[PDB]
Write a protein that binds this ligand. Structure first.
Ligand SMILES: OC[C@@]1(O)OC[C@@H](O)[C@@H](O)[C@@H]1O
Ligand SMILES: OC[C@@]1(O)OC[C@@H](O)[C@@H](O)[C@@H]1O
Ligand SMILES: OC[C@@]1(O)OC[C@@H](O)[C@@H](O)[C@@H]1O
Ligand SMILES: OC[C@@]1(O)OC[C@@H](O)[C@@H](O)[C@@H]1O
Ligand SMILES: OC[C@@]1(O)OC[C@@H](O)[C@@H](O)[C@@H]1O
Ligand SMILES: OC[C@@]1(O)OC[C@@H](O)[C@@H](O)[C@@H]1O
Lengths: 90, 90, 90
């Protein structure tokens, strides 16, 4: 009966992203060094995980949002969220 | 009815931290290359996530502990755990 | 009643590993830059977390699989999964 979170970070300041699954919806809070704010990610899901990697100074984020046995991958690559190629046969 | 864990690591040896939420309490186990031991983190929460980053050789850890819809951020920056500025309106 | 995932990544292409706990079993999907495929990890568990680190170009993965209050660590160090030394007194 609690929310469920996932977190990732990059750099040294750092930048942080925290995803919260709450009543079937996943939202995103962001830190870039000067206060928390609400990010552009808002998608359905009961469970969330995240990973990210830098290429130079460019961040790439992958969020795995699951409802039932269906996991949807969401991708941030500098210019908006897009649905990723991830599949699994759960 | 199972415990729930979160893990982070840094360096090459490496150092590892594993957080376990169990019956509303989050505790920490630590690896620095020569055996597992119990860490200083002990806080209430039904759900845990973690991220960390290095600045040179200095580790910074953020633990997100949630009870109900309330997420509390805990910060390690070399000299003790402190409550962080994270908020969310869940 | 949803599956539960954990994710890690390394490099710049990148490589990604996504672990899914589903009905007491944890399986692994892999991305190395040219399509998702099923990995060698298949172990019992209701809950999963993961962390990984590079040593040069060599990846090291630690997966924490929990059933009830018992967490088992699984280790990938380039040549097969092995059970790790992790213990906790949950
Ligand atoms: O600057 C904030 C932002 O653009 O950062 C990258 C992603 O986390 C986005 O969802 C988010 O809105
Ligand atoms: O679209 C970006 C993408 O190719 O990045 C690597 C993996 O995350 C893929 O599933 C994903 O589709
Ligand atoms: O050396 C152990 C320790 O100081 O490492 C940093 C943090 O994980 C602390 O909670 C922990 O007690
Ligand atoms: O106190 C340390 C701090 O500033 O570090 C960056 C973010 O984790 C903040 O929420 C946090 O308060
Ligand atoms: O190339 C795939 C593979 O060998 O990568 C490392 C680990 O993720 C293994 O479980 C997996 O089968
Ligand atoms: O076997 C590899 C190992 O030594 O790596 C570091 C830690 O993950 C240990 O628990 C583990 O046993």
């Amino acid at each position: 009966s609690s929310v469920q979170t996932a977190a990732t970070s990059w750099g040294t300041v750092p930048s942080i992203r925290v995803y919260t699954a709450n009543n079937g919806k996943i939202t995103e809070r962001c830190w870039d060094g000067k206060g928390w704010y609400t990010g552009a990610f808002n998608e359905p899901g009961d469970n969330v995980s995240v990973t990210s990697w830098l290429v130079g100074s460019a961040i790439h984020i992958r969020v795995y949002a699951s409802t039932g046995t269906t996991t949807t991958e969401w991708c941030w690559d500098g210019n908006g969220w897009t649905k990723g190629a991830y599949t699994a046969t759960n």
